[PDB]
Write a protein that binds this DNA or RNA. Structure first.
Ligand SMILES: [Mg+2]
Length: 110
RNA sequence: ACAGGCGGUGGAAACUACCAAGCUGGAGUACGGUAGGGGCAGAGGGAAUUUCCGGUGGAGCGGUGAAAUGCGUAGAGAUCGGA
């Protein structure tokens, strides 16, 4: 399984088995980016490549991607995962869905 | 003098009012149907978030017009499971 978390400030990529035990991970920050460059779609490509490249070597051709949240790199990360030597079954997005649960913050003025 | 005010007196009875009977168009009751987050009170339900418990794993996470404070190898964030 390949959990990916998209956002405007960073994109995280954690790999794990079906049982939920991580084997490796890497984000835009670990790759070398910092600040606003992390949220760019290009950083998601390079961040996804470094995390999955070690996994393709250790067998496990099967994979499932779990997208979580918005961002510019969520679509670019698919090109990184697709541009690889692995198949995949699910392309589902495990996003939260609050039914008017809590109070969000106030709107920004600037 | 007119106009106007007060009081008395004899007449007219539409209108306002009074008195005696009538009607139902306004209003209301009894019925028979009907929609709705009307209100009060008591039970039931799920996600989401937060904290704690552990497992996995190892360096960033998070934030900004840019940055830092801050959280983190005393194991964060992420990822399954549970209260
Ligand atoms: Mg008369």
């Amino acid at each position: 399984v390949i959990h990916v978390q998209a956002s405007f400030n960073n994109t995280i990529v954690t790999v794990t088995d079906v049982r939920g035990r991580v084997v490796s991970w890497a984000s835009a920050g670990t790759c070398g980016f910092r600040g606003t460059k992390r949220g760019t779609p290009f950083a998601a490509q390079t961040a996804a490549g470094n995390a999955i490249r070690t996994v393709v070597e250790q067998g496990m051709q099967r994979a499932e991607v779990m997208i979580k949240g918005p961002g510019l790199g969520r679509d670019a990360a698919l090109r990184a995962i697709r541009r690889s030597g692995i198949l995949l079954s699910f392309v589902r997005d495990v996003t939260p869905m609050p039914h008017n649960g809590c109070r969000p913050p106030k709107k920004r003025r600037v």
